[PDB]
Amino acid sequence: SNFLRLSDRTDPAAVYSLVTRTWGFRAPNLVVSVLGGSGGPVLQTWLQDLLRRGLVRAAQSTGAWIVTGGLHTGIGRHVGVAVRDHQ
Amino acid sequence: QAQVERIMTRKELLTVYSSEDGSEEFETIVLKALVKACGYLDELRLAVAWNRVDIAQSELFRGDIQWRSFHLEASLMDALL
């Protein structure tokens, strides 16, 4: 993966240019920012189906970026599980 | 009556093949009869012992359980051997 420790007061232009040009990421056609996440390692089955069949599949078809927390907990963990199951 | 009481004493070893269950659901029922007896084996190691990759895929895809690293490593060693 590509990681960068960056200050809180970092202008988005520099990091976006780093991602698109230096790290070789295509510019997104859509950005879905996933928020929230109820406590508990187990999500509702319909919610998991929505994350996998709905969000990740649409992101792959439209060439989108899925943006959330990168940590292995909460909604980040659930979106990662959806990505893994889709792949 | 005493014999039936002794039967029900170890009631975790008894499973019922309900009339609702179809024939195509035989193996799954066997699974739910074996792992319940365990509580060593898990559904992944049983799926590897048999040649049923569909059962392994179904078990891995279900989200209610969270398979840990020692389940997966045991199943992978069984599959490699």
Strand residues in A16-85 grouped as ranges (E): 31-33, 65-67
Nearest-neighbour CA in chain A from B54: distance (Å): 15
Rounded to an integer, what distance in angstroms lies between the CA atom of residue B64 and that of residue B36?
A: 16
Q: How far apart are CA A64 and CA A57, in angstroms?
A: 10
A41 touches chain B (CB under 8 A): yes
Instruction: Single out the residue of B10, B49, B15, B48 nearest to residue B32, CA to CA.
Output: B15
Q: Which residue of B has its CA nearest to A78?
A: B63
Q: Determine contact, residues A46/A52, Cβ cutoff 8 Å.
A: no
The H or E element that residue A12 is part of is helix A12-17
Query: Could you tell me which residues are beta bridge partners of residue A66?
Result: A32
Q: How many CB atoms lie within 10 A of CB A81?
A: 19
Nearest alpha-carbon partner for B42 in B11, B66, B13: B66
Resolution in A: 2.6
Annotate B11-50 with b (16+ C-beta within 10 A) or e (fewer).
eeeeeeeeeeeeeeeeeeeebeeeeeeeeeebbbbbbbee
**How far B63 CA lies from chain A's nearest CA (Å)?**
7
Contact criterion met (CB below 8 Å) for A81 and A49: no
C-alpha of A69 from chain center: 7
Comparing CB atoms, the residue among A42, A81, A85 nearest residue B64 is: A42
- Which site among B64, B65, B69 would you substitute to test the A interface, given the most A Cβ atoms closer than 10 Å to its Cβ? B64
What part of B 16-75 touches A (C-beta under 8 Å)? 61, 63-64, 66
Residues of A in contact with B61 (CB under 8 A): 85
Experimental method: cryo-EM
| Residues present in chain A in total | 87
CA distances from B27 to B20, B30, B36, B54 (A): 15, 5, 14, 11
